[model samples]
Each structure stands twice: as structure tokens, then as C-alpha cells.
Target: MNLSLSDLHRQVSRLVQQESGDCTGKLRGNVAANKETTFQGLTIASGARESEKVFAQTVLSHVANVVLTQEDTAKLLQSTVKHNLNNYDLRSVGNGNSVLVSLRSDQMTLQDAKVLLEAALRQESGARGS
Candidate 1:
């Protein structure tokens, strides 16, 4: 089964809130990073134009071991952003940048990612457990 963008967002938000605590405040003030700035002391630039380095570091430090390979962790984060933007048809609305900032700032907690993934899986399988 295919999940809509809002369904994905809701699941992610719920899981993130459960695992990372309230991240709304952290996301509010963050500015989208540009090529000029670095994230979490990392020099690599993000496609989102935001310094998601802190978010990446947090995920590496906290959730990477449980959820994915090093390469997969990065790909997951990038894919989530792209998926949200494409699914929501929001590329023209400028919300994609904010979505990236919010997820990154929250470190894309395992709980959040898991929730969305599980939902996707359930949709595909037509069954739910755990």
C-alpha cells in the first residue's frame, strides 16, 4: 500500500515526539543552510541549503547503530526530504527547506523513521504486528 504525504508526516511527527521529546522549538529558529555555512562542524554542503550537520551528528551519535548502515543513514535522510517534497507537491511552495531543517534538527530519530517505515510496510503487506 502507498501512504500519502500527510500520513507519512503524521507518523514521523508522532514518533519523533515520542523519542526525541518536543523538537518544535529547535526547528523553529533554524535557518536553512547555504553553501557558505557548515553543519555540526562538517564541511560538506547539504542539498537542503541548511546546516543539518548537527542533525546528522545527533543521528550518528544516537540512532545510526540501530537503524542502518552508514551509507543508508545518509540516504534515508535525503530520501525522506525528497519524498516529502515530491509527494506533497510542495516544491513550489518553499516548504521543502523547512521539512529538511525540521527532520535534520530532530536528528531524524529512529522512532520517527521507524514509524513511517512501519506504516509503509503495513500498507504494502496489508497486515500489522507490533
Candidate 2:
């Protein structure tokens, strides 16, 4: 029903790597020789990770009851970026076995979310000694 902490980490790392790779590939494809690439920053909300209401109130943003599958996580990531800004939230849920990832995509980048998840995982790992 839930993923282990290590499994959660693995899944997240995989997805983040995938996203980073895709972004890089797109840049390569669109950019010309020694030319600057264009970036589209759509209209979206940007704010502090812990302060935004969407990240705080949404069920997807929650860390508890994390029952999402790997595919589910991937879909959420895509949808967030396509529809929202770039804000994302990832956290361990359900006794630290599963992970809950919520994206607002208005403020935080996927890279930022990945780092946030990594830091949180380390902090929790030390605290729980797991």
C-alpha cells in the first residue's frame, strides 16, 4: 500500500533526473550555435515553499497518506508544469514508506523541489535513524 523510504527516494531521484534530462535535451534542440535560448515564464504565482496556500492546503501537497504510484507521481509532475508555474512539493508519507508530492508550479522549480526533498530526506533519516 505504501513505498519504503528508500523506494521513495529512488522514485524521486529517477523522476528528477528524467525531468532534468528532458529540459536539457529541449534546450539543445532549440538553441542555435552560440545563441541564447528563449525561456517562457508563464503567468503563475511564485512564493515561499512553506508559505503558499496551494502547497499547504492541497491534498497532493500533503506528506501523509501517500499512496501514489510511480506513474501517478510522474503524471502529477507533468500536469503541474503544464498548467501551473514550476512549484513542487515532495515528502515522505505513511510512516515514511510512501511519498507524497504536490506541485504548485508557481514559484519553485523542479530542481528546487528535488533539493528540498533531498534535504528533508536527510534530516528525517538522521532523526529517525533509519
Candidate 3:
């Protein structure tokens, strides 16, 4: 089955909500855990590059279970911003297919959640198609 952007958003959002808990309130401060360690205890060590690599791996593992490529995951994020934030522009970063979205300083909006879900769905769809 083909999944549209909205469908993907729903799946990713549910997964995120289940894993991260409620993502409301201020962005940075409200993060469930610091990059040094996720609540799950995936640690970020001393080296900046190494730590970033570890963090990326953690993110990749988490997302890979739900979605597919990093690229599709990014698309979901773009769709999410479009869905949630009223003034947000998906076009600002070109199309959803090639964008990487980091959390903004503001709260995690519904749009953000939706985009993630959408990415997950897209991954699933692509795999099924293959």
C-alpha cells in the first residue's frame, strides 16, 4: 500500500509519543533527556565527532525500526512542519524528500510530530513496494 505524507506522519508521531512521551512545551528544555544520555541510557561520550556519531547511530536505530532511509525520515519531518506549524514553510527547504529537520527552539508542534510519522509511513510503503 502507498502511504501519503499524512499517513506517514501519524505512524511516526505515535511511535515518537510512545517512546519519548509527551513532546509538548519548550523545545530544548523539554527534551526528555540530554544528548549526553537518552532516557534509555544511550550515552554520548567525550569526543564531539564520536559523540555525534553515536547520537546519530542511536537516532538511526530508533528510526530504522520504524522507517527506512534517512532521506525518507527527513521527508516526514518536512511534512510534519507543514502539518503542525501554521506559518511554517516546507518550500523553505525545497521538498520534503531531501531535508533534514532538527528540533527548533520552540515547542514540538503537531506538525513536527506528523512529519516524523509520515516519514515512517513512507519507509514502510517503499519497502513494501520493493
Candidate 4:
């Protein structure tokens, strides 16, 4: 049906809000409770799974530091990062309520991102290792 694509445009907008709303609440401390969350690279198409995963991953990447307490988002970061890093490199963005991560050229390698994330998992909150 020709109306399907227009319906899908609305659907993508709705789903983006859902994920961002749930994610902001789930991620405590650094999250901006009332701030706008703009998602990246979402498309209204049949082959949207990959784009969706990336959209989620980018959000999770911002909260990796807080993931020490919230393991669900933490593990999601690691799972997607491990599988997807070959095509991406971890870079830094302007920190806001969340510690944002970016993907680009020659800033941080895949192993570098992996090390930081895995370390976050094992790291004890609020204390340094002696």
C-alpha cells in the first residue's frame, strides 16, 4: 500500500521517543530527566534493524560510566561494541548530562574502547584500586 511509508514515518518518530524515554529513566545520575534526546541515524524502512541497533548503541555509549551500577545497559554496550567496533572507532564528544562517545577516524581504537568498557564493568564504584 502507498500509505505504508507515511505510516512508517510516524512509527519511527514514535519508537525513537519510546527508546529515549525509557533509556533516560533507566540511566540514572548523569541523565537529563527533562532534556530533549535526539537520536541518530534512524530510517523508516524494512531493513531498519541495523539502524535501530546503532541508534540504541549510541545512546548506551553515552552512559558507559554510569553503567558500573546499571549492568543491563552496560552489557548492552559491551555486546554491541564488541560485535560492531570493527566498523567504528571510539571518539569523544562534548560531555553533557551523559559522557558521550563518538565514532570517527584515529581518535581511539576498537581495543581502546573495549578496554575502557570492560574496565568499567570490573571497576568498583567510588573507590580506586590500590
lDDT of each: 0.30, 0.34, 0.34, 0.29
Alpha-carbon shift of residue 110 in model 2 (angstroms): 2.2
Pairs that clash in candidate 2: 3-97, 45-106, 85-105, 86-105, 87-105
Error of 4 at 7 (Å): 21
Question: How many collisions per candidate?
Answer: 4, 5, 9, 0
List the candidate numbers ranked by TM-score, top first: 2, 3, 1, 4
Deviation (Å) of 3 in candidate 1: 28
Please tell me which model should have the higher TM-score, number 3 or number 4. Answer: 3
Tens-digit per-residue lDDT, 1-130, candidate 1: 2233244334444544454332211111231212232222222343322223333333233222232333333434444543342211111112221111223232332333333233333333223321
Residue pairs in candidate 3 whose N, alpha carbon or C atoms collide under 3 angstroms:
8-117, 8-118, 9-117, 9-118, 12-117, 76-115, 80-111, 80-115, 84-111
> Candidate 4: global Cα-lDDT?
0.29
Candidate 1 vs candidate 3, lDDT winner: 3
Please report, as a residue range, the 10-residue window in candidate 1 with the lowest summed lDDT.
85-94
Candidate 1 lDDT (Cα, 0 to 1): 0.30
Instruction: Determine the backbone clash count of candidate 2.
Output: 5
Per residue, candidate 3 scores C-alpha lDDT tens digits across 1-130 of 1234343344435544564343321122111212232211112232222222332332332234343244544443443433353322222232334333343222233323334334444544433331
> Against the hidden true structure, what lDDT does model 3 obtain?
0.34
TM-score of 1: 0.24
Specify the poorest-scoring 10-residue window by lDDT in model 4. Answer: 24-33
Put down candidate 4 lDDT per residue, 18-40, tens digits, no spaces. 54332211112211221233222
